[PDB]
Amino acid sequence: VPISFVFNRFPRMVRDLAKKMNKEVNFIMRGEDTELDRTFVEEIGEPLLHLLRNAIDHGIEPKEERIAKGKPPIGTLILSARHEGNNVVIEVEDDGRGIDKEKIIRKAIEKGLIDESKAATLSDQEILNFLFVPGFVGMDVVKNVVESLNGSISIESEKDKGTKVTIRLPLT
């Protein structure tokens, strides 16, 4: 049915978390009327909650830090669903600090997952996909659930600008 069944839980969760961390967050939900199979509605909640929490906690910076960096004091967190053909696309986008791709590469080298010699030409997708590696509620589990639903997940991010996580599910 409508994804609002999941999305309606989130405003109070988001607001509670932002408050606790001295963040002002404009949380915008779009496409809440988007319908898809009830299995997906029943299961996508916990993964989305992790992404929202990540954005508030790790993404959106404290107001003082936003001001210091010359960003709007209020951060923006957008949760959207839409139809794209026979798939539904769910996006979680924030205008926070972004994911530090350099830090990912440094850790992958440290963990012996890649050699330094390969770092210079790694694609952005290949870098950000290390986030799904176990040990790198967890981001690994987010991907495992999405893929159990025959979905896919990708991440785009730019330092200091923010992060967008995209989930594609079938309508099934």
Ligand X SMILES: Nc1ncc2ccc(OCCc3ccccc3)cc2n1
List CB contacts of 104: < 8 A, sequence separation 6 or more: 127, 128, 130, 131
Q: Does position 73 bind ligand X by CB under 6 A? A: no
Asked if 54 touches ligand X (CB under 6 A), the answer is yes
Amino acid at 103: K
Strands 75-84 and 152-158: unpaired
Binds ligand X (CB under 6 A): choice among 72, 83, 138, 158: 138
Q: Does 58 bind ligand X (CB under 6 A)?
A: yes
Q: Which residue matches tokens 């669903």?
A: 81
Task: Check: CB of residue 77 under 8 Å from CB of residue 14.
Answer: yes
**Window contacting ligand X (CB under 6 A); options: 10-18, 21-29, 95-103, 107-115:** 95-103
Quote the least distance from Cβ 33 to ligand X, whole Å. 25
Distance CA 40, CA 171 (A): 9
Assess 91 for contact with ligand X (CB under 6 A). Answer: no
Question: Which residues of this chain interact with ligand X, rule CB under 6 A?
Answer: 54-55, 58-59, 94, 96-99, 131, 138-139, 163
